[PDB]
Amino acid sequence: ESTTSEQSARMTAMDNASKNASEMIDKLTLTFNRTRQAVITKELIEIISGAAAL
Amino acid sequence: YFRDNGKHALIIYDDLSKQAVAYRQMSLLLRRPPGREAYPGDVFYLHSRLLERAAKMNDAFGGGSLTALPVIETQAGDVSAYIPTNVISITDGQIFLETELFYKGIRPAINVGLSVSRVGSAAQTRAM
Amino acid sequence: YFRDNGKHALIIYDDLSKQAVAYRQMSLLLRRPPGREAYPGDVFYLHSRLLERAAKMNDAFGGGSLTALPVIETQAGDVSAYIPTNVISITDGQIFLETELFYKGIRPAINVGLSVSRVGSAAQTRAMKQVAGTMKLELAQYREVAAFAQFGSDLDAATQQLLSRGVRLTELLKQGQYSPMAIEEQVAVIYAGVRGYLDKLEPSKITKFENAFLSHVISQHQALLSKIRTDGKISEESDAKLKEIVTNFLAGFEA
Amino acid sequence: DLEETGRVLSIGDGIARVHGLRNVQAEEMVEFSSGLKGMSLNLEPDNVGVVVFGNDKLIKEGDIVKRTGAIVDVPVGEELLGRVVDALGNAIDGKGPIGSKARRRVGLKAPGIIPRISVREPMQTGIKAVDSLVPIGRGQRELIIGDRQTGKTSIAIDTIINQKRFNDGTDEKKKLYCIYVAIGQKRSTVAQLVKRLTDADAMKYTIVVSATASDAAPLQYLAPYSGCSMGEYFRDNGKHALIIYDDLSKQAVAYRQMSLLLRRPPGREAYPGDVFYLHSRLLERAAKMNDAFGGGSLTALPVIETQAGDVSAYIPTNVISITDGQIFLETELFYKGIRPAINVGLSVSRVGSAAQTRAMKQVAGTMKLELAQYREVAAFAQFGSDLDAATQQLLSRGVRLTELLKQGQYSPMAIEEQVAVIYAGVRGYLDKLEPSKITKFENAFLSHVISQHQALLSKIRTDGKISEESDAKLKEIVTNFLAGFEA
Amino acid sequence: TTGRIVAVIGAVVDVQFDEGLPPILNALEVQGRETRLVLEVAQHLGESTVRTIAMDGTEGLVRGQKVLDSGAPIRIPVGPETLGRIMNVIGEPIDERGPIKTKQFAAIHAEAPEFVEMSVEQEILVTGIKVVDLLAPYAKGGKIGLFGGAGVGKTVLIMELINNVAKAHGGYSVFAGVGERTREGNDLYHEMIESGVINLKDATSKVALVYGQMNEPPGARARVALTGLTVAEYFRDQEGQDVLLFIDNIFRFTQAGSEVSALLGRIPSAVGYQPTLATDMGTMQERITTTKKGSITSVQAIYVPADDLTDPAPATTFAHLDATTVLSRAIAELGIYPAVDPLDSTSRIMDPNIVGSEHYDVARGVQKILQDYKSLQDIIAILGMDELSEEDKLTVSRARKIQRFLSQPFQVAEVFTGHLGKLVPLKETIKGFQQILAGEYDHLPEQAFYMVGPIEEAVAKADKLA
Amino acid sequence: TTGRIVAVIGAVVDVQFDEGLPPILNALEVQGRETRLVLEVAQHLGESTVRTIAMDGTEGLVRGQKVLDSGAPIRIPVGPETLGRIMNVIGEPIDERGPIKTKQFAAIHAEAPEFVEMSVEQEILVTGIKVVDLLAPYAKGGKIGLFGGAGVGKTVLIMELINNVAKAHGGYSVFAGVGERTREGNDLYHEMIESGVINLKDATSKVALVYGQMNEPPGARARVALTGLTVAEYFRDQEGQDVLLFIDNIFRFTQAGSEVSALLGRIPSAVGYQPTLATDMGTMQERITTTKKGSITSVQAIYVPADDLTDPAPATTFAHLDATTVLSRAIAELGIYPAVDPLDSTSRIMDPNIVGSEHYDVARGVQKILQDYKSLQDIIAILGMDELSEEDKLTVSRARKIQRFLSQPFQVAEVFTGHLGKLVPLKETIKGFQQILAGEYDHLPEQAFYMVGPIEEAVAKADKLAE
Numbered sequence A: 001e002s003t004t005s006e007q008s009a010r011m012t013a014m015d016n017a018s019k020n021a022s023e024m025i026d027k028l029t030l031t032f033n034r035t036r037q038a039v040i041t042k043e044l045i046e047i048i049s050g051a052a053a054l
Numbered sequence B: 001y002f003r004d005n006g007k008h009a010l011i012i013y014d015d016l017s018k019q020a021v022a023y024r025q026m027s028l029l030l031r032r033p034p035g036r037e038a039y040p041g042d043v044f045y046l047h048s049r050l051l052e053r054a055a056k057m058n059d060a061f062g063g064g065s066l067t068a069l070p071v072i073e074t075q076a077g078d079v080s081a082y083i084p085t086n087v088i089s090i091t092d093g094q095i096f097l098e099t100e101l102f103y104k105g106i107r108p109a110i111n112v113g114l115s116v117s118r119v120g121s122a123a124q125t126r127a128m
Numbered sequence C: 001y002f003r004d005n006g007k008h009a010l011i012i013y014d015d016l017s018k019q020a021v022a023y024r025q026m027s028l029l030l031r032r033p034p035g036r037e038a039y040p041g042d043v044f045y046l047h048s049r050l051l052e053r054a055a056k057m058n059d060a061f062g063g064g065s066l067t068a069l070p071v072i073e074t075q076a077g078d079v080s081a082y083i084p085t086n087v088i089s090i091t092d093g094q095i096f097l098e099t100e101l102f103y104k105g106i107r108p109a110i111n112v113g114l115s116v117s118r119v120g121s122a123a124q125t126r127a128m129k130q131v132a133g134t135m136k137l138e139l140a141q142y143r144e145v146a147a148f149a150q151f152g153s154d155l156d157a158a159t160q161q162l163l164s165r166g167v168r169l170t171e172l173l174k175q176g177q178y179s180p181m182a183i184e185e186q187v188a189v190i191y192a193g194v195r196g197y198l199d200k201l202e203p204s205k206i207t208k209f210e211n212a213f214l215s216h217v218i219s220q221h222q223a224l225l226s227k228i229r230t231d232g233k234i235s236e237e238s239d240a241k242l243k244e245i246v247t248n249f250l251a252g253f254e255a
Numbered sequence D: 001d002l003e004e005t006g007r008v009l010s011i012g013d014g015i016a017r018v019h020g021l022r023n024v025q026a027e028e029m030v031e032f033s034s035g036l037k038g039m040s041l042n043l044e045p046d047n048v049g050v051v052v053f054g055n056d057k058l059i060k061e062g063d064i065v066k067r068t069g070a071i072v073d074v075p076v077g078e079e080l081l082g083r084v085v086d087a088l089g090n091a092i093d094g095k096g097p098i099g100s101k102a103r104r105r106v107g108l109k110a111p112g113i114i115p116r117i118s119v120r121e122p123m124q125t126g127i128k129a130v131d132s133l134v135p136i137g138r139g140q141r142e143l144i145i146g147d148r149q150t151g152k153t154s155i156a157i158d159t160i161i162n163q164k165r166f167n168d169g170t171d172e173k174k175k176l177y178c179i180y181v182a183i184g185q186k187r188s189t190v191a192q193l194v195k196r197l198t199d200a201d202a203m204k205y206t207i208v209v210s211a212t213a214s215d216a217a218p219l220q221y222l223a224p225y226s227g228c229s230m231g232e233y234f235r236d237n238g239k240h241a242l243i244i245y246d247d248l249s250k251q252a253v254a255y256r257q258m259s260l261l262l263r264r265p266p267g268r269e270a271y272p273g274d275v276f277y278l279h280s281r282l283l284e285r286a287a288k289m290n291d292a293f294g295g296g297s298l299t300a301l302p303v304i305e306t307q308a309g310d311v312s313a314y315i316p317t318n319v320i321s322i323t324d325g326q327i328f329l330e331t332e333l334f335y336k337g338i339r340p341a342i343n344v345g346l347s348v349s350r351v352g353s354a355a356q357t358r359a360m361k362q363v364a365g366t367m368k369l370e371l372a373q374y375r376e377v378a379a380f381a382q383f384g385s386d387l388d389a390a391t392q393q394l395l396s397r398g399v400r401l402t403e404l405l406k407q408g409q410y411s412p413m414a415i416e417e418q419v420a421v422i423y424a425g426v427r428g429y430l431d432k433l434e435p436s437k438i439t440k441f442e443n444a445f446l447s448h449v450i451s452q453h454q455a456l457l458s459k460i461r462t463d464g465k466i467s468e469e470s471d472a473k474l475k476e477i478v479t480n481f482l483a484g485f486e487a
Numbered sequence E: 001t002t003g004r005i006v007a008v009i010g011a012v013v014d015v016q017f018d019e020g021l022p023p024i025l026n027a028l029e030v031q032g033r034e035t036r037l038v039l040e041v042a043q044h045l046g047e048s049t050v051r052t053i054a055m056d057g058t059e060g061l062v063r064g065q066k067v068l069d070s071g072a073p074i075r076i077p078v079g080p081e082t083l084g085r086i087m088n089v090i091g092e093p094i095d096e097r098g099p100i101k102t103k104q105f106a107a108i109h110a111e112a113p114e115f116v117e118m119s120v121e122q123e124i125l126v127t128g129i130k131v132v133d134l135l136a137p138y139a140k141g142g143k144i145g146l147f148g149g150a151g152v153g154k155t156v157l158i159m160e161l162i163n164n165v166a167k168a169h170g171g172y173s174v175f176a177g178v179g180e181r182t183r184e185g186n187d188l189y190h191e192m193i194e195s196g197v198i199n200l201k202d203a204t205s206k207v208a209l210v211y212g213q214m215n216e217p218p219g220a221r222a223r224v225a226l227t228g229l230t231v232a233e234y235f236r237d238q239e240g241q242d243v244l245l246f247i248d249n250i251f252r253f254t255q256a257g258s259e260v261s262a263l264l265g266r267i268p269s270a271v272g273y274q275p276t277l278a279t280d281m282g283t284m285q286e287r288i289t290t291t292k293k294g295s296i297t298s299v300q301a302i303y304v305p306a307d308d309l310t311d312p313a314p315a316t317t318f319a320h321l322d323a324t325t326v327l328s329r330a331i332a333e334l335g336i337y338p339a340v341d342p343l344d345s346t347s348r349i350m351d352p353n354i355v356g357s358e359h360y361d362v363a364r365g366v367q368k369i370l371q372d373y374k375s376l377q378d379i380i381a382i383l384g385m386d387e388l389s390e391e392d393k394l395t396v397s398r399a400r401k402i403q404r405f406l407s408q409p410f411q412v413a414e415v416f417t418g419h420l421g422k423l424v425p426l427k428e429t430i431k432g433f434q435q436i437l438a439g440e441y442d443h444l445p446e447q448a449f450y451m452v453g454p455i456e457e458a459v460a461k462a463d464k465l466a
Numbered sequence F: 001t002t003g004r005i006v007a008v009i010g011a012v013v014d015v016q017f018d019e020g021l022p023p024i025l026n027a028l029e030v031q032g033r034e035t036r037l038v039l040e041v042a043q044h045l046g047e048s049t050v051r052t053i054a055m056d057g058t059e060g061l062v063r064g065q066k067v068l069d070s071g072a073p074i075r076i077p078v079g080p081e082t083l084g085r086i087m088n089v090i091g092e093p094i095d096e097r098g099p100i101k102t103k104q105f106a107a108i109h110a111e112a113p114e115f116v117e118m119s120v121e122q123e124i125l126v127t128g129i130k131v132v133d134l135l136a137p138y139a140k141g142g143k144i145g146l147f148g149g150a151g152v153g154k155t156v157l158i159m160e161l162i163n164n165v166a167k168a169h170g171g172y173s174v175f176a177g178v179g180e181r182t183r184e185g186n187d188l189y190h191e192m193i194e195s196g197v198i199n200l201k202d203a204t205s206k207v208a209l210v211y212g213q214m215n216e217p218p219g220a221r222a223r224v225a226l227t228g229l230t231v232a233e234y235f236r237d238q239e240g241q242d243v244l245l246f247i248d249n250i251f252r253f254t255q256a257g258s259e260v261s262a263l264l265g266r267i268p269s270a271v272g273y274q275p276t277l278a279t280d281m282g283t284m285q286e287r288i289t290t291t292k293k294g295s296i297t298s299v300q301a302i303y304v305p306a307d308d309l310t311d312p313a314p315a316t317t318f319a320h321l322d323a324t325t326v327l328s329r330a331i332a333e334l335g336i337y338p339a340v341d342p343l344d345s346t347s348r349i350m351d352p353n354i355v356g357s358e359h360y361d362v363a364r365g366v367q368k369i370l371q372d373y374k375s376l377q378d379i380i381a382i383l384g385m386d387e388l389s390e391e392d393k394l395t396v397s398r399a400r401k402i403q404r405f406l407s408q409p410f411q412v413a414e415v416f417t418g419h420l421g422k423l424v425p426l427k428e429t430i431k432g433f434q435q436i437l438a439g440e441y442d443h444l445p446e447q448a449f450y451m452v453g454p455i456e457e458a459v460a461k462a463d464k465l466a467e
């Protein structure tokens, strides 16, 4: 009984952990791309502000 | 015209994200300083002055109204972005539609927890 | 004025984040083109020329000094950012504080691994050096091992000891506000810990122990404390006396 | 005369603003009184923006600037082989003048669509990982890309070294003349490089075009095009050339300096809107010519340095997009012991099989598939206690094939030696060999087949493929050798 | 009138005119050059001076050099004579086959069809390709985002599309290579010759080619989409056809506009794109549509920067797309051709109010079963296929047959394969998949449904397999 | 020829000349000043006006103040008279010991040695620093760079190198303090008087000092590296000798350039830097070199702004080096000093044909186990240790022991460690990491390997720890 319960539970736990990680990946990927876009724009605004001030 | 002549009008702005993109083109071409997401600092005001005009008039002003349903497009559900937050900070609540619910066939794909009407309750029929 | 006239001064710049913002404003309005983060290109120099002026003079120039504690406010805990690193790249060290530490009860909220002195034991009395000389590296290794050991399963004798010491030292470096401590009192207290006499005391009791221990040595052993303060060190005699006080007192404390 | 001469209005930062020169053409080489050259990049109503080929100290306000009938061309021909020159083709190796009998403009149009034919002929690097899984054909543009210090220059150097086996041979079709363009490197680095090729006896068929870190920006800007024209001499006369641009990140930085200082508008990462154009016109000049045009070719291996693996930064984006494929190198692979540090999952050659000999095509296809199957299961290796037999095998085969893709520096391999090594892996012979021993097995195995089995290697090369006979030979060499190895 | 060059700064040329100025978008012909140098007017700077963008390299230009105003935007040859021919952005032949002898020329800049000229109907453009027509069908006058790249039968699909639209709808095709790689443009051309969609010997060419190659200046790569589009517009407007326009690829159209915008000194917008990102795309895309006279339907290869779908470039493009065709390497390695991902491909007109309730219920039934089959695949790898309920056994059987019946032999591949290509009518596609779902062919073997056209051929293949 | 000041804004002064315009790079001498104020010509603006960078403060300058063209670039004293002296950017003594009585002077601006002047010889220079010697060794006459963010250990490392290599060096050394702490300059000076490599009483000094620190305006900091370099060039060429050049910190040359750049009229490049960053660095760096005439072993501390190695300044520097020692805050934070990233440090001589196959093999094995551990960390920090195979967890224990045996007490760092300084011979380093990898110390605890010299000290420490 012990092993049937344990292996069922590990399967469920790991399935849950796998799906959680999966959700965390998505979320971090969106965060990544929001930051990536911000970085490119910020850098560009610094250049233009520096240039226009001349 | 209807608002002030004792009648009732409904206006849909479909959509305000595209209008802000157009105003950003104008501003950058005018060489106005770019800010957050390269939008000009008056991009909030662009929308606020427009949405302030939707109003309920009292009987002394004819009792008319103008209801506004502005539309805003999010990128991958990001409600915290600059333009979405600007408009949330203007309107009297939001109906939020989720890609996840829509994909699952739950339609209209309204996320109930994320939706509000700040002032609509007093205007709901008792039967409802 | 003190520095050049044989006296010693301490200056606090609270803060240099706000000063750099005012310089930015002033520079932009002068039509000087903006650089990184809209600050002028020479925002490092703004602060470098200021802080270089804190200095220790030789005896021929009067032997005076000026010590500087500039202050910088970071955003979202990022000591690695442009302006912060600019100022770190000027000073002879930094004390880095974090909210996380603060709310967990590490107050003062000093991150040990991320803080440094660039003068080290040269700036310490011999007595403090005697008790604190290896502690900073030791605490860095402690925090690393405590993170690696996180999944509590079979730890060897060495790391378990490293852990027990570390968790207790952390309690000893906690301190309240508005009662800064005389050096000899700091040494007596740190001594009890680094010498291991507290290794079997429950970590939550350390703070209660310190305050009771301190009030005891202050009242009863003003001569031992006097000698450490005056000699600037822990002599073999002072050491023997301290050992006898902490072992027997702790035992009383634990009754 | 302000039609044919001008006067310096201002000078600083490698830009001379010149009054007059009413008749200058855009991009014309002009000459300052001191003898320094400059190129006319900005033609403006009241001034010419002239980019300075040397030190500003020698140009002062009011200096006379002349048109001379100058044309921006370089020496071209076999007389450049074995020589180290600067961006303008001047000898810098101290071995006297180039004996050049012909010249060619650095700025010329790439062959159009019609004069070309499909890339077909192998361009053999001698590097197992590349020739098998990222194969390059004559006329291709294949990018070498990765962070600093990941092995990029070495890919190219080993490719150049490899050609000796053909250039020494008797088959003129298979011969490949090499051009290494150094842009923005330090002189001693270039010196180590040519010493390497000299020792390898590869210099005799290599031209080194070098515009190093203290050369002025316009020179670094021209150098790739200069080397490119020298390569086109071979392309256009029925011969084959390989050019390495090491590297294009540095060339683009040099051009950005010029563009920013001419006050041309800045865009992403402060690059101008023509930096894509900069690289695209260079890389389209690599071509495979049809028979009516002599059947020659120019293959290009541009190099790009990424920063912290950012393949989406501006210049890597441009050059990835322009090229026919990419060989991606990675730091973590390097320190893991995967050297060459080629990411075999990401690396691509869109020319692909069309550029491979039958023998390689066979085993490389099997290896590609088995490495992909391995990659799917890879993360379950060091966390796999109770895996089924099938997945246990995919891992076993994967780790062994991966070990066989490791290769020492400066030792490029004949294609038949490559296939014989890969055979041992794809046919399962090493599946029970402990992975740490594979590189040792290969080195000894290869030494043995080269020594005792030249005939077998001959047949793998000649037959095009691996016959039933070659297969029976290898089976018996491998199994017997292996049992001796593990004895 | 005749003007004089007053400035040359890379691909930006300023020209002064003494009398009337060429309006913006006009084509100017630079005099005294070995080959045609066209400048397009971008701005009126004041003081009788226009700022232009060059359509070729500007090396060798002198200040005071003569420039002729053509009196119009870039005008290019249009008509049947363009079919099988390759032109550049300014309408010159680049295939070395002599002049393009059309009787009409047309300006590459035109306003989009007016509101009154719009079709208010939405109809499928039947492609004859089972996956596409059933699961993610093309809208007539719509835009389709094609995902994939290399090694997934992209060219073959493009060529089959050209073949099928000509066969089924009498409509010709235009291929616009935006930032075309010279090597690949050459190979595409001969592939089109070998497949027969281009014919050198007669007048049966189905496609006109327009190449804006990578080594050309930003202005040329920016405008080629328009040149291609203009060629297509002749077939819609003058011949009432349902036309196909391929844009390969749209990201390079956006990027060329970003480069031109930079050259003109315009302040860049978010992530560095042109501030005019949305209007550059809009003035182009809106020309592709169904009018009362006919349609242009566009298949557009999409490159997604940094794999970021929220990047301004794909986000701007996606506003215009009515469908996606996703070509997948995983699908190709299963031997399914065309390698279209049946779950990843989508269409906006997959709606009962547009394609009908029957088409909708069958498509949705195919999607569901495929989704369901994916859910069982983990259980197969664990428990085995003989441990499934009699309903689940049946969904695997049917799903797998459906997976195979979604494949289809192409006419354009008759050379390389030897098998006859199949163009399948929509009603037969619908019927075929309707019957497999209903369980009408549970008795037939799985492999009978592989590489077949209509459902009857799967019955006939089942019989032929003894 | 006499000129007049027409504009002053910060470090940048514009000067009009009525007759002969001074060429770019010329030193101009400002009249009516208490201490010598030099302006260096940067650009000819047109209209008989030149734009200059000042070498000292511009406070007190007045529009109309007279300026004399000297007729050449900044020229400084070079030769044996520089030995044991401190000089500033413009070659003035700043040690209060009177004139520098050289027979000859040299311009701080010079052409870089030609390609034909290059040497390809490279032999190991043993440091006694385990992590350097094992994984990324220095070469005699080579270009060495020490990269690090603020306060990770660049300067402590350069001082340990000065301590280990320069004290017993047979030839001359130059130390160039560039945009760093004045305190550090006074420390080094009196330390070198104490060791006798500087001698204030006789002619036995082996080191010349050149300083222009962060109390100095950007002009001084952008040129003081050249002053230091020009001194070393003389020693290299006009004595053909073995020269050591230490520069702390070469970033400050690039940074100084960025401070004046907008006032020089440049549109900025990315990250706020001058468009000329790379060519400026190139013309300077290519002079810092061994030639056929003589050898320079150059060691340069390289600051890394915001800890970002992709920052244009350090990123552009890498290509100029033959060995790179990259320091990491994440490693320092663990108390691992020196804070060398063993997976981001390189050397041109790290090659089995140069260092031999045993040294190569051990180094790569060390790097392999550390990368293997690195890829396991974050994975086992969530899924647990007990899920590892009994050979996978053996790479963990060995790697964590190898991380610590890479740490080392520095002699110069005693005031920070409380430990006595250790120097470890090359062969002992090899043997030690070779033995750990082989499993010879699986029984010893992690901490035994932390902060010691040779392997035997880890064995002895393990005993001390036992009780």
Ligand SMILES: Nc1ncnc2c1ncn2[C@@H]1O[C@H](COP(=O)(O)OP(=O)(O)NP(=O)(O)O)[C@@H](O)[C@H]1O
Pocket: D147, D148, D149, D150, D151, D152, D153, D154, D155, D339, D340, D407, D408, D409, F318, F319, F347, F348, F350, F351
């Ligand atoms: N196959 C290999 N096996 C072992 N070592 C190699 C191999 N290839 C390259 N290396 C070494 O790895 C280091 C980096 O090689 P290199 O070709 O200089 O890469 P890179 O990216 O061009 N470096 P850089 O240009 O300085 O950013 C050198 O020390 C080479 O000797």
Ligand SMILES: Nc1ncnc2c1ncn2[C@@H]1O[C@H](COP(=O)(O)OP(=O)(O)O)[C@@H](O)[C@H]1O
Pocket: C116, C117, C118, C119, C120, F148, F149, F150, F151, F152, F153, F154, F155, F156, F157, F337, F338, F339, F410, F413, F416, F417
């Ligand atoms: N090898 C080392 N051993 C012990 N402590 C060190 C070591 N290197 C650096 N530190 C600590 O870090 C501080 C900063 O080192 P430093 O060399 O000044 O950094 P950088 O020059 O890179 O800014 C030192 O003052 C010292 O406290």
Ligand SMILES: [Mg+2]
Pocket: D152, D153, D154
């Ligand atoms: Mg390299």
Ligand SMILES: [Mg+2]
Pocket: F154, F155, F156, F180, F248
């Ligand atoms: Mg330092």
